[PDB]
């Protein structure tokens, strides 16, 4: 069931849409130079993101998981939103002044949509720049470089790099009085439940959508991979913007190849 590659046709749908949902994934961050540690060429040491972003990995080797997230936090300091992020933010602003809604549902944890100025933003998997205490549950913003002294200079990505093996007491710890708990990234890991309040907001946006754009996602991680297919199955137009086809491509009305930073400025003008 081959989707259309006609931008002119897509633009006629775009012109009429009053409730656009944009779902974004790791490819949009990759176009800003962010290492995603997914796909055929994405590895930190000898692992991919889905090997380390798990409760079991964190239970068995919290130092290694923290090294991985520390590396990613520090690299992000030098990364900026790309033309795709900017086109999405500019579109939201322009349509909002016309009484038309754009909402971004991002799988990404990098805060690049936020940095680009997107306002209607659902970060469905949390953030690299938030911590949660495993003892008291408090969630906090954390941009500190480095997040703790023991991690300074650690997290190097080359294969064969030795574990830092930081004692748990010297990994990031809660600073609330009397707690002292071990912090973790406030990131939804593989095997964990997404936040119910966020899923309810997603459900409402999808149910009312009249055009859905699926941008830079491989459509292999659930639940997010089912969002756009659910809309399409009700007849709602979906346009996939991706450098490759995915398992979901043939469910959608349009497929546009190339970097999202090249195609979205045209599509959303």
């Amino acid at each position: 069931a081959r989707p259309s590659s006609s931008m002119a046709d897509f633009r006629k749908f775009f012109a009429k849409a009053k409730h656009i949902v944009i779902i974004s994934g790791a490819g949009v961050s990759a176009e800003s130079g962010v290492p995603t540690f997914r796909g055929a060429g994405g590895y930190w040491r000898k692992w991919q993101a889905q090997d380390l972003a798990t409760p079991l990995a964190f239970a068995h080797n919290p130092s290694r998981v923290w090294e991985f997230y520390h590396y990613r936090r520090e690299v992000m300091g030098s990364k900026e939103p790309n033309a795709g992020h900017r086109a999405i933010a500019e579109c939201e602003t322009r349509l909002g002044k016309q009484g038309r809604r754009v909402v971004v549902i991002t799988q990404n944890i990098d805060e690049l949509h936020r940095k680009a100025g997107t306002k209607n933003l659902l970060e469905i998997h949390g953030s690299l720049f938030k911590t949660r205490c495993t003892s008291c549950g408090v969630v906090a913003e954390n941009y500190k470089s480095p997040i703790c002294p023991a991690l300074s200079g650690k997290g190097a990505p080359e294969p064969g790099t030795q574990d830092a093996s930081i004692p748990v007491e010297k990994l990031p710890r809660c600073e609330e009085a009397g707690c002292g708990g071990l912090l973790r990234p406030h990131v939804v890991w593989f095997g964990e439940n997404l936040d119910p309040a966020i899923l309810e907001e997603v459900d409402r946006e999808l149910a009312h959508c009249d055009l859905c754009l699926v941008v830079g996602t491989s459509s292999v991680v659930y639940p997010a991979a089912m969002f756009a297919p659910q809309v399409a199955a009700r007849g709602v137009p979906v346009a996939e913007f991706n450098t490759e086809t995915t398992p979901a491509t043939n469910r959608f009305r349009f497929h546009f190849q190339g970097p999202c930073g090249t195609t979205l400025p045209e599509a959303l003008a």
């Binding site: 889905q50 119910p196 292999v220 659930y222 639940p223 991979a225 398992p247």
Partner: peptide
């Protein structure tokens, strides 16, 4: 539709 994050097989 599951609220559990899963790298689909």
């Amino acid at each position: 539709x599951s609220a559990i994050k899963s790298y689909g097989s």
